[PDB]
């Protein structure tokens, strides 16, 4: 946990790890991660409430979430050091109490906005 970074603008953790997870439909995914984009100035519609948009990437290609994405992490693996970090992932997820506590990378779209 030496490259683990806590981003506090949106209370998440940037960690270079992959997740093997199972949803509520028994579907299995391997070597998947998440990328969060903090967009406070995004041009929202009437029904958008989140300040961040999250994209799930498995095997280097993103997923189109058509079903409910309620999922449980079965095995989290740190890429740099192949040591299993699943227990730390669940600990942080229980502590953080935010959607997708651990994220591969956080993109900040505030400073590059014309309204910044």
């Amino acid at each position: 946990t030496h490259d683990l970074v806590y981003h506090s603008k949106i209370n998440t953790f940037v960690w270079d790890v992959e997740f093997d997870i199972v949803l509520s439909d028994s579907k299995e995914l391997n070597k998947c991660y998440f990328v969060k984009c903090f967009n406070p100035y995004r041009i929202n519609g009437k029904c958008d409430f989140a300040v961040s948009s999250i994209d799930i990437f498995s095997e280097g290609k993103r997923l189109l979430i058509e079903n409910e994405f309620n999922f449980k992490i079965t095995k989290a693996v740190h890429v740099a050091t192949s040591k299993d970090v699943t227990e730390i992932v669940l600990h942080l997820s229980e502590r953080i109490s935010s959607p997708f506590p651990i994220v591969k990378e956080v993109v900040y779209l505030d400073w590059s906005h014309p309204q910044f």
Partner: protein, 629 residues
């Protein structure tokens, strides 16, 4: 060291105990009567001296200094990015060996490093004052270093490119084997080492250590700024007008970065100190814009933007900056619309083009120049450097000083139709590093027009069938741009049967108004969750609080999700269950609506105050300060 020559052009007696020849020269210059006293040879020598001193910006002594005008003016095609003119100059036949030195520099600046090395070798052959010979040796060593580093980087890096043939690499490795740049100056004729001592620093590994250490004066908190800026201009003019390739090296780029960043930070510090004391400085011009574009990375510009208020920095010579940006756009088009891609040139040029188009946010651009820049950015900027999201960010930055005209809206519409055409293929998927996709361009168009209907996308939609699914779920995110007929045709390809389809429709913008059947579906899901009690709950609560739902039969499910109970009825919520991190997930609209509720406002104000006092969190502080939630 007989005199100091200051960056403003004033001379000061420093260390000569003999005659004041500089003062006498200036006295001769000011008044013509004593000029006739000189001999004819002395008269023409004085004329040459006067031309040299006025060309180098040396006016008079400090004691006689008056209204001193210090305007930077670099006579270099390489500095101004006149790539077409540089190519024309290289195409021409070089009359002199000094034209060959300029040609070799221009070849280096255009990425043609093999030709530049060959020309420098030829100049070294034909050059034995011997000042071009020494400069050619310096620049050939520099270009050999550049070639070596580029070969290393290309071996390290998205497609394997071989710009330099291995025979050329071996030839230059053998030619420059055991070549000592340090021994170069000492091996020159003893007259050269006397007349051209000032050139010896060009053989050093580092030559900007002094200028960098004097940058600490900009970090003092107790003019230095003018001295630093004029010193930077002096270095730039010397390295570019004299066609020295070390101007492209990381040391010089880092020096320019450090000096400009510290100057802007210092100006910001003076502005804030004055505001603190006076209760209500750096004025950027064409040369500063070009320096930042050429030498700053995007991360460096982002550090500048977060550290200081660049919007409080007014920009001058905006017609010159617009010409620079239009030239950058034209070169982007030439490099990528055609097959003119030079990989060596591309590596150095793409960073400057990116930085220039990023910094163009602060520049007012004419409609035609904005059209050129926007078209080049949207269509001819390579996707390996600027993906769909990054290119959208760059484009949207251009609306800060130029509210979207009709021509730019048409260009973005052309881009959207091209993206839709790319979605004929089922395999094609947009790759974005920012999470921003083609939907964001249409969102921007509708933001700046509110009534724009794109005819070509409507035509594409009306031609759509059920087979090419990719086009339907692409154009669904672009629904506001379509016409009524196109909207009706598209809406037939999706169903809202179950609650998951409803969530998909809201997320992709399929439906923006909640019908009673959607409310019934939401209630069905809520009843199922309540029954199975012994992710969408917060979303439904937020929708009810945002007046997106007026069903009023939701209070049955209070007590399962804390956020849902908080949003459905703020008055009856117990705020020991409130999690402050919730406020970090809401956007501007939701936070503002929470602030204006007249309920739960004081509870969340106390929560934000506790978070600010306990943790000194900048996000919580700015949330509490902006919306006063």
């Amino acid at each position: 060291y007989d005199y100091h020559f200051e960056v403003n052009g004033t001379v000061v007696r420093h260390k000569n105990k003999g005659f004041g020849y500089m003062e006498r020269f200036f006295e001769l210059k000011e008044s013509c009567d004593e000029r006739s006293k000189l001999s004819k040879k002395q008269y023409e020598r004085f004329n040459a001296l006067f031309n040299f001193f006025e060309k180098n910006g040396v006016i008079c002594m400090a004691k006689d200094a008056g209204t001193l005008n210090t305007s930077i003016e670099i006579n270099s095609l390489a500095y101004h990015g006149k790539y077409d003119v540089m190519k024309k100059f290289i195409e021409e036949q070089s009359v002199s060996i000094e034209d060959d030195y300029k040609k070799a520099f221009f070849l280096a600046c255009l990425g043609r490093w093999e030709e530049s090395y060959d020309l420098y070798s030829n100049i070294i052959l034909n050059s034995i004052n011997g000042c071009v010979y020494y400069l050619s040796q310096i620049n050939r060593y520099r270009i050999y270093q550049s070639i070596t580093q580029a070969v290393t980087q290309f071996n390290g890096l998205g497609r394997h490119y071989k710009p330099f043939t291995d025979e050329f690499l071996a030839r230059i490795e053998r030619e420059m084997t055991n070549f000592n740049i340090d021994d170069l100056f000492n091996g020159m004729p003893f007259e050269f080492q006397k007349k051209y001592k000032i050139l010896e620093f060009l053989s050093d590994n580092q030559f900007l250590y002094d200028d960098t250490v004097k940058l600490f004066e900009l970090t003092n908190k107790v003019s230095s700024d003018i001295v630093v800026l004029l010193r930077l201009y002096d270095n730039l003019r010397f390295l570019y007008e004299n066609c020295l390739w070390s101007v492209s090296f990381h040391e010089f780029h880092q020096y320019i970065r450090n000096s400009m960043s510290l100057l802007i930070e210092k100006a910001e510090y003076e502005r804030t100190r004055d505001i603190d004391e006076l209760g209500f400085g750096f004025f950027m011009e064409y040369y500063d814009f070009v320096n930042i574009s050429r030498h700053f990375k995007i991360d460096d510009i982002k550090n500048l933007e977060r550290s200081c208020s660049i919007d409080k920095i007014r920009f001058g010579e905006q017609e010159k900056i617009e010409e620079y940006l239009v030239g950058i756009a034209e070169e982007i088009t030439k490099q990528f619309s055609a097959n003119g891609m030079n990989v060596v040139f591309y590596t150095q040029f793409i960073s400057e083009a990116k930085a220039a188009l990023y910094f163009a946010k602060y520049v007012k651009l004419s409609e035609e120049g904005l059209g050129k820049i926007v078209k080049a950015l949207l269509f001819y900027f390579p996707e390996r450097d600027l993906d769909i999201g990054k290119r959208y960010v760059w484009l949207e930055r251009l609306t800060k000083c130029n509210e979207l005209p009709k021509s730019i809206i048409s260009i973005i519409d052309d881009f959207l139709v091209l993206q839709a055409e790319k979605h004929i293929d089922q395999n094609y998927s947009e790759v974005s590093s920012n999470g921003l996709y083609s939907r964001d361009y249409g969102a921007l168009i509708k933001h700046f027009e509110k009534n724009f209907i794109s005819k070509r996308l409507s035509e594409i939609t009306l031609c759509l069938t059920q087979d090419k699914q990719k086009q339907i779920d692409f154009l669904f995110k672009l629904l506001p741009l379509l016409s009524t007929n196109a909207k009706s045709h598209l809406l037939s390809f999706k169903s809202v049967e179950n609650i998951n389809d409803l969530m998909n429709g809201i997320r992709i913008g399929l439906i923006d108004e909640f019908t009673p059947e959607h409310e019934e579906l939401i209630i069905e899901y809520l009843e199922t969750r309540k029954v199975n009690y012994i992710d969408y709950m917060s979303t439904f609560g937020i929708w009810y609080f945002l007046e997106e739902i007026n069903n009023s039969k939701m209070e049955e499910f209070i007590g399962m999700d804390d956020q849902y109970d908080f949003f459905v009825d703020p008055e009856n919520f117990d705020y020991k269950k409130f999690i402050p991190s919730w406020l970090k997930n809401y956007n501007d609209k939701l936070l503002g609506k929470i602030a204006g509720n007249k309920h739960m406002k004081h509870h969340v104000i106390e929560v934000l105050k506790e978070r600010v006092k306990n943790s000194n969190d900048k996000r919580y502080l700015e949330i509490l300060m902006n919306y006063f939630i």
